[PDB]
Protein backbone atom coordinates (compact mmCIF):
# COMPACT_ATOMS: atom_id res chain seq x y z
CA UNK A 1 0.00 0.00 0.00
CA UNK A 2 1.10 3.53 -0.79
CA UNK A 3 1.14 5.98 2.09
CA UNK A 4 -1.60 8.59 1.71
CA UNK A 5 -0.68 12.06 2.94
CA UNK A 6 -2.44 15.40 3.34
CA UNK A 7 -0.24 18.24 2.08
CA UNK A 8 -1.96 21.38 3.31
CA UNK A 9 -4.09 23.38 3.63
CA UNK A 10 -2.26 24.32 6.83
CA UNK A 11 1.19 23.79 5.32
CA UNK A 12 3.88 26.43 4.66
CA UNK A 13 4.67 24.90 1.24
CA UNK A 14 0.97 24.79 0.28
CA UNK A 15 0.98 28.47 -0.88
CA UNK A 16 -2.62 28.87 0.22
CA UNK A 17 -5.58 26.64 0.98
CA UNK A 18 -4.58 23.59 -1.07
CA UNK A 19 -5.32 20.04 0.04
CA UNK A 20 -2.80 18.02 -1.97
CA UNK A 21 -3.65 14.37 -1.36
CA UNK A 22 -0.49 12.47 -2.21
CA UNK A 23 0.21 8.77 -2.65
CA UNK A 24 3.78 7.91 -1.76
CA UNK A 25 6.11 4.94 -1.82
CA UNK A 26 8.81 5.99 0.62
CA UNK A 27 9.28 9.63 -0.34
CA UNK A 28 8.67 8.99 -4.04
CA UNK A 29 5.44 10.56 -5.25
CA UNK A 30 3.21 7.94 -6.85
CA UNK A 31 0.22 10.24 -7.31
CA UNK A 32 -0.80 13.87 -6.82
CA UNK A 33 -4.48 14.74 -6.28
CA UNK A 34 -4.91 18.50 -5.77
CA UNK A 35 -8.13 19.21 -3.89
CA UNK A 36 -9.16 22.84 -4.39
CA UNK A 37 -12.25 24.84 -3.51
CA UNK A 38 -11.08 25.84 -0.03
CA UNK A 39 -11.09 29.42 -1.36
CA UNK A 40 -14.12 29.21 -3.65
CA UNK A 41 -16.23 32.20 -2.70
CA UNK A 42 -18.78 32.04 -5.47
CA UNK A 43 -17.44 35.18 -7.14
CA UNK A 44 -19.14 34.72 -10.52
CA UNK A 45 -22.69 34.49 -9.15
CA UNK A 46 -21.98 37.55 -7.00
CA UNK A 47 -20.74 39.38 -10.09
CA UNK A 48 -24.12 38.57 -11.66
CA UNK A 49 -25.93 40.49 -8.93
CA UNK A 50 -23.75 43.55 -9.36
CA UNK A 51 -23.43 46.38 -11.85
CA UNK A 52 -20.34 46.57 -14.06
CA UNK A 53 -18.66 49.11 -11.77
CA UNK A 54 -19.61 47.16 -8.64
CA UNK A 55 -18.03 44.00 -10.07
CA UNK A 56 -14.62 45.60 -10.62
CA UNK A 57 -13.22 45.14 -7.06
CA UNK A 58 -13.73 41.37 -7.45
CA UNK A 59 -10.97 41.31 -10.06
CA UNK A 60 -8.63 42.88 -7.51
CA UNK A 61 -9.22 39.88 -5.28
CA UNK A 62 -8.99 37.15 -7.92
CA UNK A 63 -5.18 37.11 -8.16
CA UNK A 64 -3.98 39.13 -5.12
CA UNK A 65 -0.59 39.66 -6.36
CA UNK A 66 -1.45 41.14 -9.81
CA UNK A 67 -4.37 43.42 -8.91
CA UNK A 68 -4.15 46.03 -11.67
CA UNK A 69 -3.46 43.38 -14.29
CA UNK A 70 -6.74 41.73 -13.29
CA UNK A 71 -8.48 45.10 -13.44
CA UNK A 72 -7.05 45.82 -16.88
CA UNK A 73 -8.30 42.53 -18.32
CA UNK A 74 -11.83 43.17 -17.05
CA UNK A 75 -11.73 46.79 -18.22
CA UNK A 76 -10.63 45.71 -21.69
CA UNK A 77 -13.50 43.23 -21.88
CA UNK A 78 -16.06 45.84 -20.84
CA UNK A 79 -14.59 48.51 -23.15
CA UNK A 80 -14.71 46.08 -26.06
CA UNK A 81 -18.36 45.39 -25.26
CA UNK A 82 -19.09 49.14 -24.95
CA UNK A 83 -17.36 50.00 -28.26
CA UNK A 84 -15.45 52.86 -26.61
CA UNK A 85 -11.77 53.78 -26.37
CA UNK A 86 -9.67 54.82 -23.37
CA UNK A 87 -7.58 57.97 -23.87
CA UNK A 88 -3.85 57.67 -24.64
CA UNK A 89 -2.58 58.93 -21.28
CA UNK A 90 -4.78 56.38 -19.51
CA UNK A 91 -3.35 53.60 -21.67
CA UNK A 92 0.22 54.66 -20.88
CA UNK A 93 -0.65 54.74 -17.16
CA UNK A 94 -2.19 51.28 -17.51
CA UNK A 95 0.90 49.81 -19.16
CA UNK A 96 3.22 51.46 -16.63
CA UNK A 97 1.29 50.11 -13.66
CA UNK A 98 0.91 46.73 -15.36
CA UNK A 99 4.69 46.48 -15.55
CA UNK A 100 5.05 47.61 -11.93
CA UNK A 101 2.50 44.91 -11.05
CA UNK A 102 4.47 42.34 -13.05
CA UNK A 103 7.51 43.27 -10.96
CA UNK A 104 5.46 42.76 -7.79
CA UNK A 105 4.18 39.37 -8.93
CA UNK A 106 7.56 38.10 -10.10
CA UNK A 107 9.23 39.15 -6.85
CA UNK A 108 6.55 37.31 -4.88
CA UNK A 109 6.81 34.19 -7.04
CA UNK A 110 10.61 33.94 -7.10
CA UNK A 111 11.08 34.66 -3.40
CA UNK A 112 8.33 32.30 -2.23
CA UNK A 113 9.77 29.60 -4.49
CA UNK A 114 13.20 30.16 -2.93
CA UNK A 115 11.64 30.14 0.55
CA UNK A 116 10.05 26.71 -0.04
CA UNK A 117 13.31 25.42 -1.39
CA UNK A 118 15.01 26.70 1.76
CA UNK A 119 16.72 29.94 0.71
CA UNK A 120 14.89 32.26 3.08
CA UNK A 121 17.09 35.35 2.74
CA UNK A 122 16.16 36.86 -0.69
CA UNK A 123 12.54 37.20 0.44
CA UNK A 124 13.44 39.89 2.98
CA UNK A 125 15.64 41.76 0.51
CA UNK A 126 12.93 41.88 -2.15
CA UNK A 127 9.96 42.63 0.09
CA UNK A 128 11.32 46.10 0.85
CA UNK A 129 11.13 46.79 -2.89
CA UNK A 130 7.63 45.34 -2.88
CA UNK A 131 6.83 47.77 -0.05
CA UNK A 132 7.98 50.75 -2.12
CA UNK A 133 5.81 49.63 -5.03
CA UNK A 134 2.88 49.28 -2.61
CA UNK A 135 3.57 52.91 -1.74
CA UNK A 136 3.27 53.79 -5.43
CA UNK A 137 -0.08 51.98 -5.52
CA UNK A 138 -1.25 53.85 -2.45
CA UNK A 139 -0.28 57.30 -3.71
CA UNK A 140 -2.25 56.85 -6.93
CA UNK A 141 -5.38 55.22 -5.41
CA UNK A 142 -5.32 55.36 -1.60
CA UNK A 143 -4.89 51.59 -1.28
CA UNK A 144 -1.72 49.52 -0.93
CA UNK A 145 -2.96 46.54 -2.96
CA UNK A 146 -6.67 46.49 -3.91
CA UNK A 147 -6.50 49.79 -5.71
CA UNK A 148 -9.46 49.53 -8.14
CA UNK A 149 -7.70 52.26 -10.20
CA UNK A 150 -8.20 50.82 -13.65
CA UNK A 151 -11.79 51.29 -14.73
CA UNK A 152 -13.67 50.34 -17.91
CA UNK A 153 -13.23 53.94 -19.09
CA UNK A 154 -9.58 54.55 -18.32
CA UNK A 155 -8.30 55.24 -14.81
CA UNK A 156 -10.08 56.73 -11.82
CA UNK A 157 -7.71 59.62 -11.03
CA UNK A 158 -4.73 61.34 -12.59
CA UNK A 159 -1.27 60.73 -11.17
CA UNK A 160 -0.28 62.99 -8.26
CA UNK A 161 2.08 65.79 -9.09
CA UNK A 162 5.35 64.06 -8.14
CA UNK A 163 4.77 60.35 -8.72
CA UNK A 164 6.78 59.97 -11.93
CA UNK A 165 9.96 61.24 -10.26
CA UNK A 166 9.68 58.71 -7.44
CA UNK A 167 8.92 55.89 -9.88
CA UNK A 168 12.07 56.90 -11.74
CA UNK A 169 14.12 56.93 -8.52
CA UNK A 170 12.90 53.45 -7.63
CA UNK A 171 13.44 52.11 -11.15
CA UNK A 172 17.06 53.24 -11.39
CA UNK A 173 18.08 51.12 -8.37
CA UNK A 174 16.08 47.92 -8.87
CA UNK A 175 18.51 46.24 -11.28
CA UNK A 176 21.14 45.99 -8.52
CA UNK A 177 18.60 44.24 -6.30
CA UNK A 178 17.91 41.76 -9.11
CA UNK A 179 21.69 41.34 -9.40
CA UNK A 180 21.97 40.52 -5.69
CA UNK A 181 19.15 37.99 -6.04
CA UNK A 182 20.97 36.38 -8.97
CA UNK A 183 24.21 36.30 -6.99
CA UNK A 184 22.34 34.42 -4.29
CA UNK A 185 20.63 31.92 -6.57
CA UNK A 186 21.68 31.69 -10.22
CA UNK A 187 25.07 29.96 -9.90
CA UNK A 188 24.55 28.19 -6.57
CA UNK A 189 25.12 24.47 -7.06
CA UNK A 190 22.56 23.66 -4.35
CA UNK A 191 19.89 25.76 -6.06
CA UNK A 192 20.69 24.20 -9.43
CA UNK A 193 20.51 20.74 -7.87
CA UNK A 194 17.08 21.60 -6.49
CA UNK A 195 15.89 23.14 -9.78
CA UNK A 196 17.68 21.64 -12.81
CA UNK A 197 15.74 18.83 -14.54
CA UNK A 198 12.89 19.02 -12.00
CA UNK A 199 9.37 19.22 -13.41
CA UNK A 200 10.32 18.95 -17.09
CA UNK A 201 7.40 19.46 -19.48
CA UNK A 202 7.52 19.12 -23.25
CA UNK A 203 6.25 21.76 -25.66
CA UNK A 204 3.49 19.50 -27.00
CA UNK A 205 2.31 18.64 -23.49
CA UNK A 206 2.41 22.28 -22.39
CA UNK A 207 0.26 23.27 -25.36
CA UNK A 208 -2.28 20.47 -24.92
CA UNK A 209 -2.69 20.82 -21.15
CA UNK A 210 -3.57 24.49 -21.61
CA UNK A 211 -0.43 26.03 -20.16
CA UNK A 212 0.41 29.68 -20.78
CA UNK A 213 3.05 32.25 -19.95
CA UNK A 214 6.33 31.09 -18.45
CA UNK A 215 5.16 27.46 -18.40
CA UNK A 216 5.23 27.70 -22.19
CA UNK A 217 8.33 29.86 -22.59
CA UNK A 218 10.51 27.61 -20.44
CA UNK A 219 9.83 24.81 -22.94
CA UNK A 220 10.95 26.91 -25.91
CA UNK A 221 7.52 27.92 -27.22
CA UNK A 222 7.76 31.48 -28.56
CA UNK A 223 4.51 33.06 -27.41
CA UNK A 224 3.86 36.29 -25.51
CA UNK A 225 0.45 37.93 -25.71
CA UNK A 226 1.94 41.41 -25.49
CA UNK A 227 3.83 40.71 -28.72
CA UNK A 228 1.34 38.57 -30.63
CA UNK A 229 -1.96 40.20 -29.58
CA UNK A 230 -0.96 43.59 -28.15
CA UNK A 231 -3.32 45.74 -26.10
CA UNK A 232 -3.18 49.35 -24.85
CA UNK A 233 0.20 50.76 -25.99
CA UNK A 234 2.24 47.54 -25.84
CA UNK A 235 2.95 47.82 -29.56
CA UNK A 236 4.84 51.06 -28.90
CA UNK A 237 7.35 49.68 -26.36
CA UNK A 238 10.44 47.57 -27.00
CA UNK A 239 11.38 44.50 -24.95
CA UNK A 240 12.71 40.97 -25.38
CA UNK A 241 10.86 37.80 -24.46
CA UNK A 242 12.92 35.30 -22.43
CA UNK A 243 12.89 31.74 -23.76
CA UNK A 244 13.98 28.54 -22.05
CA UNK A 245 15.62 25.43 -23.42
CA UNK A 246 14.90 22.50 -21.10
CA UNK A 247 11.41 23.00 -19.66
CA UNK A 248 12.50 22.58 -16.05
CA UNK A 249 12.19 24.64 -12.87
CA UNK A 250 15.62 26.19 -13.40
CA UNK A 251 14.72 27.51 -16.85
CA UNK A 252 11.46 28.98 -15.54
CA UNK A 253 13.38 30.81 -12.80
CA UNK A 254 15.77 32.37 -15.33
CA UNK A 255 12.82 33.38 -17.49
CA UNK A 256 11.17 35.18 -14.57
CA UNK A 257 14.36 37.03 -13.62
CA UNK A 258 14.89 38.20 -17.20
CA UNK A 259 11.21 39.13 -17.36
CA UNK A 260 11.82 41.37 -14.34
CA UNK A 261 14.66 43.07 -16.22
CA UNK A 262 12.50 43.56 -19.33
CA UNK A 263 9.76 45.08 -17.18
CA UNK A 264 12.33 47.60 -15.93
CA UNK A 265 13.06 48.37 -19.59
CA UNK A 266 9.36 48.87 -20.38
CA UNK A 267 8.92 51.06 -17.29
CA UNK A 268 11.81 53.27 -18.36
CA UNK A 269 10.15 53.72 -21.74
CA UNK A 270 6.75 54.43 -20.23
CA UNK A 271 8.24 57.06 -17.92
CA UNK A 272 9.89 58.86 -20.81
CA UNK A 273 6.81 58.65 -23.07
CA UNK A 274 3.84 59.60 -20.88
CA UNK A 275 1.68 62.06 -22.85
CA UNK A 276 -0.67 64.74 -21.50
CA UNK A 277 -4.45 64.73 -21.63
CA UNK A 278 -7.46 63.36 -19.83
CA UNK A 279 -7.49 60.05 -17.99
CA UNK A 280 -10.93 58.61 -18.78
CA UNK A 281 -13.06 58.49 -21.90
CA UNK A 282 -14.70 61.85 -22.58
CA UNK A 283 -18.14 60.23 -22.61
CA UNK A 284 -20.23 60.97 -19.53
CA UNK A 285 -22.71 58.18 -20.27
CA UNK A 286 -19.88 55.73 -19.45
CA UNK A 287 -17.35 57.59 -17.31
CA UNK A 288 -18.38 59.86 -14.43
CA UNK A 289 -17.81 63.60 -14.86
CA UNK A 290 -15.58 65.73 -12.68
CA UNK A 291 -16.99 66.91 -9.36
CA UNK A 292 -16.94 70.61 -10.27
CA UNK A 293 -18.99 69.82 -13.38
CA UNK A 294 -21.23 67.57 -11.28
CA UNK A 295 -21.85 70.51 -8.97
CA UNK A 296 -22.38 73.11 -11.72
CA UNK A 297 -24.11 71.44 -14.69
CA UNK A 298 -27.51 69.75 -14.85
CA UNK A 299 -26.47 67.08 -17.36
CA UNK A 300 -23.36 66.25 -15.36
CA UNK A 301 -25.40 65.82 -12.18
CA UNK A 302 -27.97 63.63 -13.95
CA UNK A 303 -25.24 61.44 -15.42
CA UNK A 304 -23.40 61.19 -12.08
CA UNK A 305 -26.64 60.13 -10.38
CA UNK A 306 -27.49 57.53 -13.00
CA UNK A 307 -23.97 56.13 -13.33
CA UNK A 308 -23.69 55.65 -9.57
CA UNK A 309 -27.19 54.23 -8.98
CA UNK A 310 -28.05 52.17 -12.05
CA UNK A 311 -24.77 52.21 -13.97
CA UNK A 312 -24.22 52.26 -17.70
CA UNK A 313 -25.93 49.72 -19.92
CA UNK A 314 -23.74 47.48 -22.08
CA UNK A 315 -25.06 46.40 -25.49
CA UNK A 316 -25.85 42.68 -25.69
CA UNK A 317 -23.05 40.34 -26.65
CA UNK A 318 -20.32 38.04 -25.44
CA UNK A 319 -16.56 38.53 -25.53
CA UNK A 320 -13.49 36.56 -24.56
CA UNK A 321 -10.73 39.04 -23.69
CA UNK A 322 -7.28 37.80 -22.71
CA UNK A 323 -4.15 39.53 -21.45
CA UNK A 324 -0.61 38.44 -20.62
CA UNK A 325 -0.90 38.57 -16.85
CA UNK A 326 2.31 37.92 -14.87
CA UNK A 327 1.14 34.34 -14.18
CA UNK A 328 0.08 33.52 -17.74
CA UNK A 329 -2.89 34.22 -19.97
CA UNK A 330 -5.67 35.79 -17.89
CA UNK A 331 -9.07 35.88 -19.53
CA UNK A 332 -12.68 36.98 -19.13
CA UNK A 333 -15.67 35.53 -20.95
CA UNK A 334 -18.20 38.30 -20.38
CA UNK A 335 -21.83 38.00 -21.48
CA UNK A 336 -24.04 41.11 -21.58
CA UNK A 337 -27.81 40.90 -22.02
CA UNK A 338 -28.21 44.63 -22.72
CA UNK A 339 -28.72 45.90 -19.16
CA UNK A 340 -26.37 47.45 -16.57
CA UNK A 341 -25.62 44.10 -14.95
CA UNK A 342 -23.47 41.37 -16.52
CA UNK A 343 -25.43 38.27 -17.41
CA UNK A 344 -22.43 35.96 -17.15
CA UNK A 345 -18.78 36.34 -16.18
CA UNK A 346 -16.50 33.32 -16.56
CA UNK A 347 -12.94 33.92 -15.37
CA UNK A 348 -10.04 32.06 -16.99
CA UNK A 349 -7.03 31.77 -14.69
CA UNK A 350 -3.75 30.17 -15.84
CA UNK A 351 -3.24 28.59 -12.42
CA UNK A 352 -6.24 26.34 -13.04
CA UNK A 353 -4.54 24.56 -15.94
CA UNK A 354 -1.11 24.65 -14.29
CA UNK A 355 -2.45 22.95 -11.16
CA UNK A 356 -4.37 20.47 -13.31
CA UNK A 357 -1.00 19.57 -14.84
CA UNK A 358 0.90 19.42 -11.53
CA UNK A 359 0.23 15.67 -11.34
CA UNK A 360 1.74 15.18 -14.79
CA UNK A 361 4.80 17.27 -13.98
CA UNK A 362 5.59 15.33 -10.78
CA UNK A 363 6.02 11.83 -12.24
CA UNK A 364 9.14 10.13 -10.91
CA UNK A 365 9.96 12.84 -8.36
CA UNK A 366 10.26 13.04 -4.58
CA UNK A 367 8.47 15.16 -1.97
CA UNK A 368 10.91 18.08 -2.12
CA UNK A 369 10.73 18.06 -5.92
CA UNK A 370 6.94 18.32 -5.70
CA UNK A 371 7.35 21.33 -3.40
CA UNK A 372 9.67 22.88 -5.99
CA UNK A 373 7.15 22.19 -8.77
CA UNK A 374 4.31 23.84 -6.83
CA UNK A 375 6.62 26.82 -6.36
CA UNK A 376 7.57 26.95 -10.04
CA UNK A 377 3.98 26.90 -11.26
CA UNK A 378 3.33 30.29 -9.56
CA UNK A 379 -0.04 29.43 -8.02
CA UNK A 380 -2.38 31.82 -6.21
CA UNK A 381 -5.59 30.13 -5.18
CA UNK A 382 -7.80 33.20 -5.38
CA UNK A 383 -7.66 32.92 -9.16
CA UNK A 384 -7.79 29.10 -9.12
CA UNK A 385 -10.92 28.79 -6.97
CA UNK A 386 -12.72 32.13 -7.48
CA UNK B 1 11.95 39.65 -30.39
CA UNK B 2 13.37 37.13 -27.95
CA UNK B 3 16.52 36.10 -26.11
CA UNK B 4 17.76 32.79 -24.71
CA UNK B 5 18.31 32.34 -20.98
CA UNK B 6 20.11 28.95 -20.94
CA UNK B 7 21.76 28.42 -24.33
CA UNK B 8 25.43 29.04 -23.52
CA UNK B 9 28.21 26.50 -24.03
CA UNK B 10 31.27 26.29 -21.73
CA UNK B 11 34.83 26.63 -22.96
CA UNK B 12 36.95 23.48 -22.98
CA UNK B 13 40.48 24.87 -22.81
CA UNK B 14 42.79 23.71 -20.02
CA UNK B 15 42.59 27.04 -18.18
CA UNK B 16 38.78 26.94 -18.14
CA UNK B 17 38.80 23.31 -16.99
CA UNK B 18 41.19 24.14 -14.15
CA UNK B 19 39.07 27.15 -13.13
CA UNK B 20 35.97 24.95 -13.05
CA UNK B 21 37.84 22.31 -11.04
CA UNK B 22 38.84 24.99 -8.55
CA UNK B 23 35.21 26.10 -8.41
CA UNK B 24 34.10 22.52 -7.73
CA UNK B 25 36.74 21.62 -5.15
CA UNK B 26 37.26 24.95 -3.34
CA UNK B 27 33.61 26.14 -3.44
CA UNK B 28 34.07 29.61 -4.92
CA UNK B 29 30.43 30.49 -5.70
CA UNK B 30 29.41 29.46 -2.18
CA UNK B 31 31.93 31.97 -0.84
CA UNK B 32 30.35 34.51 -3.20
CA UNK B 33 26.96 33.93 -1.57
CA UNK B 34 28.51 34.19 1.88
CA UNK B 35 30.04 37.50 0.80
CA UNK B 36 26.66 38.82 -0.30
CA UNK B 37 25.06 38.00 3.06
CA UNK B 38 28.06 39.46 4.89
CA UNK B 39 27.66 42.64 2.85
CA UNK B 40 24.01 42.91 3.86
CA UNK B 41 25.00 42.44 7.52
CA UNK B 42 26.83 45.80 7.51
CA UNK B 43 24.03 47.81 5.87
CA UNK B 44 21.49 49.84 7.79
CA UNK B 45 18.27 47.85 8.33
CA UNK B 46 15.09 49.18 6.74
CA UNK B 47 13.09 48.69 9.96
CA UNK B 48 11.08 51.55 11.49
CA UNK B 49 10.42 52.11 15.20
CA UNK B 50 6.65 51.51 15.32
CA UNK B 51 4.50 52.95 16.97
CA UNK B 52 6.94 55.86 17.39
CA UNK B 53 7.69 55.86 13.65
CA UNK B 54 4.92 55.45 11.07
CA UNK B 55 4.74 54.34 7.48
CA UNK B 56 4.22 57.07 4.89
CA UNK B 57 0.70 57.65 3.62
CA UNK B 58 -1.11 59.78 1.04
CA UNK B 59 -4.02 62.25 1.08
CA UNK B 60 -5.93 59.70 -1.01
CA UNK B 61 -5.56 57.03 1.70
CA UNK B 62 -8.74 55.08 2.44
CA UNK B 63 -9.43 54.44 6.11
CA UNK B 64 -12.20 54.60 8.71
CA UNK B 65 -15.40 56.25 7.51
CA UNK B 66 -16.77 59.55 8.78
CA UNK B 67 -19.81 61.79 8.27
CA UNK B 68 -19.00 65.48 7.80
CA UNK B 69 -20.72 68.82 8.42
CA UNK B 70 -20.96 72.21 6.82
CA UNK B 71 -19.02 74.99 8.60
CA UNK B 72 -22.31 76.02 10.23
CA UNK B 73 -22.45 72.68 12.05
CA UNK B 74 -25.28 71.39 9.86
CA UNK B 75 -24.74 67.87 8.52
CA UNK B 76 -23.83 67.57 4.86
CA UNK B 77 -25.76 64.34 4.26
CA UNK B 78 -29.14 64.78 2.59
CA UNK B 79 -30.11 61.09 2.35
CA UNK B 80 -29.86 60.78 -1.43
CA UNK B 81 -28.83 57.12 -0.84
CA UNK B 82 -26.30 57.07 -3.68
CA UNK B 83 -23.68 55.62 -1.33
CA UNK B 84 -26.11 52.86 -0.39
CA UNK B 85 -26.86 52.13 -4.06
CA UNK B 86 -23.23 52.06 -5.19
CA UNK B 87 -21.77 50.06 -2.30
CA UNK B 88 -20.56 46.74 -3.77
CA UNK B 89 -20.67 45.03 -0.37
CA UNK B 90 -24.14 46.36 0.62
CA UNK B 91 -22.46 47.65 3.77
CA UNK B 92 -24.57 50.84 4.05
CA UNK B 93 -28.08 50.98 5.52
CA UNK B 94 -30.05 54.22 5.30
CA UNK B 95 -33.42 55.38 6.60
CA UNK B 96 -34.64 58.94 6.16
CA UNK B 97 -37.58 61.22 6.91
CA UNK B 98 -38.33 64.97 6.92
CA UNK B 99 -36.78 66.65 9.94
CA UNK B 100 -38.84 68.76 12.33
CA UNK B 101 -37.84 71.82 10.27
CA UNK B 102 -38.66 70.02 7.01
CA UNK B 103 -35.04 69.22 6.17
CA UNK B 104 -34.16 66.07 4.20
CA UNK B 105 -32.01 64.16 6.70
CA UNK B 106 -31.25 60.60 7.74
CA UNK B 107 -32.68 58.85 10.76
CA UNK B 108 -30.56 55.72 10.25
CA UNK B 109 -27.09 55.63 8.70
CA UNK B 110 -25.18 52.39 9.38
CA UNK B 111 -21.98 51.03 7.89
CA UNK B 112 -21.14 47.40 8.64
CA UNK B 113 -17.35 47.63 8.85
CA UNK B 114 -16.98 43.84 8.56
CA UNK B 115 -18.87 43.92 5.27
CA UNK B 116 -17.01 46.96 3.91
CA UNK B 117 -14.19 46.44 1.40
CA UNK B 118 -12.85 49.99 1.86
CA UNK B 119 -13.08 50.73 -1.88
CA UNK B 120 -13.98 54.40 -1.54
CA UNK B 121 -16.81 54.19 -4.06
CA UNK B 122 -19.21 55.82 -1.60
CA UNK B 123 -17.17 58.99 -1.21
CA UNK B 124 -16.89 59.21 -4.99
CA UNK B 125 -20.66 58.76 -5.27
CA UNK B 126 -21.56 61.26 -2.54
CA UNK B 127 -22.63 64.54 -4.20
CA UNK B 128 -22.10 66.74 -1.12
CA UNK B 129 -18.93 65.16 0.33
CA UNK B 130 -20.90 63.84 3.31
CA UNK B 131 -19.41 60.34 3.64
CA UNK B 132 -15.61 60.09 3.55
CA UNK B 133 -12.94 57.53 4.27
CA UNK B 134 -10.79 59.32 6.81
CA UNK B 135 -7.07 58.78 7.38
CA UNK B 136 -7.37 56.56 10.47
CA UNK B 137 -6.43 52.88 10.30
CA UNK B 138 -5.79 51.99 13.97
CA UNK B 139 -9.29 51.04 15.11
CA UNK B 140 -9.06 47.35 15.95
CA UNK B 141 -11.75 46.24 18.40
CA UNK B 142 -12.02 43.40 20.88
CA UNK B 143 -15.57 42.44 19.87
CA UNK B 144 -17.40 42.12 16.57
CA UNK B 145 -20.26 44.39 17.68
CA UNK B 146 -17.97 47.42 18.05
CA UNK B 147 -17.43 47.33 14.27
CA UNK B 148 -21.11 47.87 13.41
CA UNK B 149 -21.21 51.65 13.07
CA UNK B 150 -24.39 53.68 13.45
CA UNK B 151 -24.97 57.35 12.66
CA UNK B 152 -23.81 58.51 16.10
CA UNK B 153 -20.48 56.71 15.74
CA UNK B 154 -19.90 58.09 12.24
CA UNK B 155 -20.83 61.64 13.25
CA UNK B 156 -18.44 61.29 16.19
CA UNK B 157 -15.72 60.13 13.79
CA UNK B 158 -16.36 63.18 11.64
CA UNK B 159 -16.18 65.49 14.65
CA UNK B 160 -12.98 63.80 15.85
CA UNK B 161 -11.17 63.77 12.48
CA UNK B 162 -12.51 66.85 10.65
CA UNK B 163 -9.29 68.85 11.01
CA UNK B 164 -7.26 66.25 9.13
CA UNK B 165 -10.06 65.23 6.74
CA UNK B 166 -10.55 68.78 5.46
CA UNK B 167 -6.80 69.18 4.96
CA UNK B 168 -6.67 65.89 3.05
CA UNK B 169 -9.59 66.91 0.83
CA UNK B 170 -8.03 70.31 0.11
CA UNK B 171 -4.88 68.53 -1.12
CA UNK B 172 -6.68 66.08 -3.43
CA UNK B 173 -9.98 67.57 -4.63
CA UNK B 174 -8.38 69.09 -7.74
CA UNK B 175 -7.58 65.57 -8.96
CA UNK B 176 -11.21 64.51 -8.44
Amino acid sequence: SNLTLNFGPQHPAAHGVLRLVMELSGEMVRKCDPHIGLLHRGTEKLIEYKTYLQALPYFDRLDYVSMMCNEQAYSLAVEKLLNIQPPPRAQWIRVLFGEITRLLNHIMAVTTHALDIGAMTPFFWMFEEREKMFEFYERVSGARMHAAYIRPGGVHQDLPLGLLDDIYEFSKNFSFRIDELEEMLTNNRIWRNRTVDIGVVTAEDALNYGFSGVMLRGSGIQWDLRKTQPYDVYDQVEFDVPIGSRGDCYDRYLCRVEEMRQSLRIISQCLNKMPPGEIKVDDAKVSPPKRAEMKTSMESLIHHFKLYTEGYQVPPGATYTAIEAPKGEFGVYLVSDGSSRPYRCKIKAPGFAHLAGLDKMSKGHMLADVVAIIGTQDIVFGEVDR
Amino acid sequence: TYKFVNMREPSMDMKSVTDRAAQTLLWTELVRGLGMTLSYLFREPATINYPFEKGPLSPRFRGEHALRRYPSGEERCIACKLCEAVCPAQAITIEAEPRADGSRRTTRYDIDMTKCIYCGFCQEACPVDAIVEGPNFEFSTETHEELLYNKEKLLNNGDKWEAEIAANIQADYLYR
Binding site: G162, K172, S175, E182, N187, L264, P276 | -
Partner: peptide, 29 residues
Protein backbone atom coordinates in the same frame (compact mmCIF):
# COMPACT_ATOMS: atom_id res chain seq x y z
CA UNK C 1 -5.93 82.24 -17.36
CA UNK C 2 -3.88 79.46 -15.77
CA UNK C 3 -2.01 76.91 -17.86
CA UNK C 4 -2.42 73.14 -17.61
CA UNK C 5 -0.27 71.64 -14.86
CA UNK C 6 0.06 67.87 -14.84
CA UNK C 7 2.51 65.19 -13.77
CA UNK C 8 4.81 64.80 -16.78
CA UNK C 9 8.41 63.74 -17.39
CA UNK C 10 10.96 66.56 -17.29
CA UNK C 11 11.96 68.31 -20.53
CA UNK C 12 14.22 66.18 -22.65
CA UNK C 13 14.14 62.95 -20.68
CA UNK C 14 14.74 60.97 -17.51
CA UNK C 15 18.20 59.55 -16.89
CA UNK C 16 18.87 56.10 -18.39
CA UNK C 17 17.99 53.08 -16.29
CA UNK C 18 20.20 49.99 -16.06
CA UNK C 19 18.52 46.63 -16.54
CA UNK C 20 21.15 44.16 -17.81
CA UNK C 21 22.63 41.50 -15.55
CA UNK C 22 25.80 42.68 -13.77
CA UNK C 23 27.73 39.71 -12.34
CA UNK C 24 31.46 40.50 -12.11
CA UNK C 25 34.17 37.87 -12.43
CA UNK C 26 35.76 38.52 -9.02
CA UNK C 27 38.29 35.80 -8.39
CA UNK C 28 41.76 34.37 -8.77
CA UNK C 29 42.80 31.62 -11.18
Amino acid sequence: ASKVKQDMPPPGGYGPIDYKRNLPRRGLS
